[PDB]
Amino acid sequence: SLSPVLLGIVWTFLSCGLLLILFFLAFTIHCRKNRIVKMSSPNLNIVTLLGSCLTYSSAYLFGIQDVSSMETLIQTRLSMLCIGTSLVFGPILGKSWRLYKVFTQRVPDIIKDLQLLGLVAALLMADVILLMTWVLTDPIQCLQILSVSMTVTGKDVSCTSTSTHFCASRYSDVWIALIWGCKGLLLLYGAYLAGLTGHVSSPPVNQSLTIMVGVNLLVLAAGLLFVVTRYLHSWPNLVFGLTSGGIFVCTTTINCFIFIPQLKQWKAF
Amino acid sequence: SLSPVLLGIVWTFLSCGLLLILFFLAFTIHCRKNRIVKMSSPNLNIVTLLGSCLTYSSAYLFGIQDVLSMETLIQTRLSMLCIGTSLVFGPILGKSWRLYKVFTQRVPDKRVIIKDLQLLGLVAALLMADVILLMTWVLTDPIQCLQILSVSMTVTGKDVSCTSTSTHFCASRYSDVWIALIWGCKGLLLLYGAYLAGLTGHVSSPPVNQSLTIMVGVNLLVLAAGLLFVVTRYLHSWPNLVFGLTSGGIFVCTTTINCFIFIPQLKQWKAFEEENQTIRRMAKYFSTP
Ligand SMILES: CCCCCC/C=C/CCCCCCCC(=O)OC[C@H](COP(=O)([O-])OCC[N+](C)(C)C)OC(=O)CCCCCCCCCCCCCCCCC
Numbered sequence: 001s002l003s004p005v006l007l008g009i010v011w012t013f014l015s016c017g018l019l020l021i022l023f024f025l026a027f028t029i030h031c032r033k034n035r036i037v038k039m040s041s042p043n044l045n046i047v048t049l050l051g052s053c054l055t056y057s058s059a060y061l062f063g064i065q066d067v068s069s070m071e072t073l074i075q076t077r078l079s080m081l082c083i084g085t086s087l088v089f090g091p092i093l094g095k096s097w098r099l100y101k102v103f104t105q106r107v108p109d110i111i112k113d114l115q116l117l118g119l120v121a122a123l124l125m126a127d128v129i130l131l132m133t134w135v136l137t138d139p140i141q142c143l144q145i146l147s148v149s150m151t152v153t154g155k156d157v158s159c160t161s162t163s164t165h166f167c168a169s170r171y172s173d174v175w176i177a178l179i180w181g182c183k184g185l186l187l188l189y190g191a192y193l194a195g196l197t198g199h200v201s202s203p204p205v206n207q208s209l210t211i212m213v214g215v216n217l218l219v220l221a222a223g224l225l226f227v228v229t230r231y232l233h234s235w236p237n238l239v240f241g242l243t244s245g246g247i248f249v250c251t252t253t254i255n256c257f258i259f260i261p262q263l264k265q266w267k268a269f
Numbered sequence: 270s271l272s273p274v275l276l277g278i279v280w281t282f283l284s285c286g287l288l289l290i291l292f293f294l295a296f297t298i299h300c301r302k303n304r305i306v307k308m309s310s311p312n313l314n315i316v317t318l319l320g321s322c323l324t325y326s327s328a329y330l331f332g333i334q335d336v337l338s339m340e341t342l343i344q345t346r347l348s349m350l351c352i353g354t355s356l357v358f359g360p361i362l363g364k365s366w367r368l369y370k371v372f373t374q375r376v377p378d379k380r381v382i383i384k385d386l387q388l389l390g391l392v393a394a395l396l397m398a399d400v401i402l403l404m405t406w407v408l409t410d411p412i413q414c415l416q417i418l419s420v421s422m423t424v425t426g427k428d429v430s431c432t433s434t435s436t437h438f439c440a441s442r443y444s445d446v447w448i449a450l451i452w453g454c455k456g457l458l459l460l461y462g463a464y465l466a467g468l469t470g471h472v473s474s475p476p477v478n479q480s481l482t483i484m485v486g487v488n489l490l491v492l493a494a495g496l497l498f499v500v501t502r503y504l505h506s507w508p509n510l511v512f513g514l515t516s517g518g519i520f521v522c523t524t525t526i527n528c529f530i531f532i533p534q535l536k537q538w539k540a541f542e543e544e545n546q547t548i549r550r551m552a553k554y555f556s557t558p
């Protein structure tokens with residue numbers, strides 16, 4: 001039910017994004033000893049690229065329908081998106097935290113990359129258990145619902161026969177609210193760390209505009225995509241295109257604000 | 270309908286909170302010319318307290334059941350919740366923005382003139398966004414109280430079952446659109462508030478600096494909003510639980526915000542009242558990172 005032209009346009013855009021991701025990964029894995037790239041924690045950024053490619057793969061996985069294994073498909077793509085945005089937004093807050101600590105606590109007077117990776121791993125483990133409880137307690141079982149409903153609002157009586165087919169959990173709002181809440185608290189502390197590391201250093205090493213535009217875009221994208229997924233599900237081309245577009249714009253935007261200053265500073269050196 | 274003991278304890282707690290708010294209002298009006306209250310923004314504290322009493326009245330109206338036009342009662346409780354939240358979280362952000370501009374514009378001459386009328390204008394713009402969103406919600410898709418009886422014959426992967434579900438809910442037809450809109454606008458506002466709390470993290474003493482109150486309030490706001498949305502959506506067979514949880518969440522959030530705003534002012538009011546020999550008595554209030 002998906003038009004081939006829309007599918008091709010989306011796949012080409014996501015392939016261009018993935019090629020840019022691979023180019024960034026090669027740049028940050030080759031120029032490790034360069035002063036500019038080493039100043040911006042090159043070993044942490046590999047986690048960001050892995051999260052970015054995971055999100056792009058999930059955006060691809062939104063592009064297939066029509067298989068009784070749709071449930072596994074939706075669970076894999078949603079869990080992949082969750083783990084991907086977790087891995088994207090981990091190291092940015094970690095770098096901001098380390099920059100704040102070396103700016104503040106060094107004045108009265110050192111954090112290694114392993115400590116920030118441990119914080120990132122704890123955050124991923126939280127995401128893993130929060131997804132495991134969802135996939136174990138109530139699955140995303142697809143059911144064919146046929147029902148007749150009588151509408152009596154107190155002034156008129158009418159009857160409606162609805163045959164609605166959808167794929168959703170028994171209590172989907174609990175899981176979306178809890179994942180929303182955990183990610184929102186994370187983005188709130190990220191905005192706090194962005195404020196703390198405000199006008200502290202150069203944008204190649206100071207991640208303040210990057211995290212702010214990423215948090216704002218993540219909030220607006222999540223709201224818009226949840227709205228267009230819940231209500232206008234009878235517009236499958238629109239839902240697929242908007243979901244893939246939101247994921248592509250977000251992932252590319254954060255990755256570009258992370259790595260464009262690095263390449264700009266490397267061009268002059 | 271609702272249990273009388275829970276209604277009594279909720280009303281008692283909200284009355285105690287409202288009397289606390291009126292006491293803070295009396296202190297702000299009385300000692301407005303005290304040096305540390307003047308170094309805070311008492312006029313903006315008036316707006317914060319007005320939002321606080323609006324959301325306390327919202328929590329009061331959450332208990333009004335089996336009386337009405339209940340569809341209008343839902344509108345008039347949620348609208349005043351949203352307006353009160355705007356009026357509470359506006360002036361704090363304005364004060365933090367003034368602190369950031371005062372302490373990070375260290376240029377000779379060119380002194381910053383940010384009068385209180387500018388910040389009341391910013392709060393008015395935020396409230397204008399609030400009222401246009403609420404007007405669109407009440408005009409396009411109003412909440413209607415509808416009772417529907419229905420039967421559903423669902424089929425699973427291998428089994429067929431039939432359920433006769435009859436329910437009565439009073440909710441919008443496009444409810445999640447309005448929830449996403451208003452929670453999203455509030456979310457952008459509170460994320461910019463977290464940014465301002467970060468920027469002004471070590472800018473002054475806790476009487477003037479509002480980093481901790483912004484961070485605590487924003488975390489409690491997200492937690493309360495998520496929990497109350499879930500328990501309102503999925504627990505209609507437990508009216509006492511949802512009423513108590515909503516009232517307690519509103520009371521806890523508003524009381525912690527107002528206590529965080531006003532308790533250090535009351536603590537440090539004495540130290541800048543009688544002697545006031547030099548401005549060296551307020552040296553931590555001129556601090557910087
Ligand atoms: C770093 C760049 C990444 C940014 C990308 C952010 C965009 C996310 C949009 C994708 C999610 C939309 C999918 C809608 C749910 C769905 O598929 O339906 C199945 C169902 C919801 O069904 P439903 O409600 O959509 O339709 C049924 C309607 N009915 C009335 C019948 C119930 O989902 C669930 O079962 C619950 C599981 C939750 C999955 C976790 C969400 C993943 C989101 C990834 C972003 C994480 C961080 C953002 C959090 C907030 C940030 C502040």
Ligand SMILES: CCCCCC/C=C/CCCCCCCC(=O)OC[C@H](COP(=O)([O-])OCC[N+](C)(C)C)OC(=O)CCCCCCCCCCCCCCCCC
Pocket residue numbers: 324343347348350351353354357406412438439440441443444445447448451452455456490491493494497498501502515518519522523526
């Ligand atoms: C400064 C401290 C303030 C603390 C207050 C924070 C707590 C807020 C709890 C709000 C409780 C909502 C009550 C739901 C009533 C209801 O059922 O209406 C029916 C509908 C939804 O119905 P329903 O889903 O709840 O039940 C019917 C179930 N059924 C499946 C059949 C639909 O709600 C709406 O339509 C609301 C439209 C939007 C109005 C916005 C309300 C204002 C919210 C508070 C101000 C914003 C502050 C929070 C933002 C923070 C962001 C993280």
